[PDB]
Assembly symmetry: C2
Homo-oligomer: 186 residues x 2
């Protein structure tokens, strides 16, 4: 039942049509985890969203999963954005992937190539793993790991390209900042 957003608005090249339609795809609906849900019919009452995954129902009560995934997404982004360094996480990826061009050109067979909707992610169990999970009802926080970066590849995460749309993750999304917010290592 939150009201995320800030840092962005017009966020360079991913529009305000797409963004405050999409920021609302997440918080008009999704923030639906409550109505004839939490309080409403399927239970859980005292939870943190963080606490929804692991314990909770299924897909219907995994719209609550959508809220986390999205307000996560929104803090993983651009508008002052760029490419890794600033420490060990640099060095992490650089020996797991081995490189970053490599990292960015692998983290796609994550994203691009997953039949349907969901999100690709940068994850860490106790060292890094690039995890598929494209179903919506996929947050690697169900298991023994926690996400460094996400990307909604659900068809409305984008559209501003339409006949031929990969340049969405590429020629649209690698102007991702919060390499400072993705900086996570433990």
């Amino acid at each position: 039942p939150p009201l995320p957003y800030a840092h962005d608005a017009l966020q360079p090249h991913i529009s305000k049509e797409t963004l405050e339609y999409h920021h609302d795809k997440h918080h008009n609906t999704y923030v639906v985890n409550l109505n004839n849900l939490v309080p409403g019919t399927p239970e859980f009452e005292g939870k943190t969203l963080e606490e929804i995954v692991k314990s909770s129902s299924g897909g219907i009560f995994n719209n609550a999963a959508q809220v986390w995934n999205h307000t996560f997404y929104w803090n993983c982004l651009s508008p002052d954005a760029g490419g890794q360094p600033t420490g060990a996480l640099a060095d992490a990826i650089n020996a797991a992937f081995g490189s970053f061009d490599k990292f960015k050109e692998e983290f796609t067979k994550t994203s691009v190539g997953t039949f349907g909707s969901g999100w690709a992610w940068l994850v860490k169990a106790d060292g890094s793993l690039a995890l598929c999970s494209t179903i919506g009802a996929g947050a690697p926080l169900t298991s023994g790991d926690t996400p460094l970066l996400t990307c909604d590849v659900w068809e409305h995460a984008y559209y501003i390209d339409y006949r031929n749309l990969r340049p969405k993750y590429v020629e649209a999304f690698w102007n991702l900042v919060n390499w400072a917010f993705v900086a996570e290592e433990g």
Copy 2:
């Protein structure tokens, strides 16, 4: 090896840049099939129509399923509208789905309720009722039902309506294939 369509990209309920993109999402995009068919082996070299759905274990391979769900659908929408099943077809619904008024308002459910990408399908086995197929390239053909009334619920199914799936289908898509070959002869 598909190149056809029942009419030209619409006009009044489903745009021209719906039928452009959706039909080629279908086309030169779902060309993934032909890429991994005879080429190496699978046992899918031969096997009639999409007998590759029934045998097939998908995603990239259950592309077969997707060629099909899309070609199924094509026939399902026609400029010739009339949410009026004659009364041969009318019978098998005006006894199952309450009535037809009550079939539609029940096909809504399954269609909007298919959580992110998927379908709402009207089948027949030798036990009758509707169907929600929420996992991607779906299809009732592995289960073995065999009339079919399609739809498409993927977000690419609507550049029109934006987030408004229902206005799109429980609205717009009551322009079903004149219940003649929806009307069953097999």
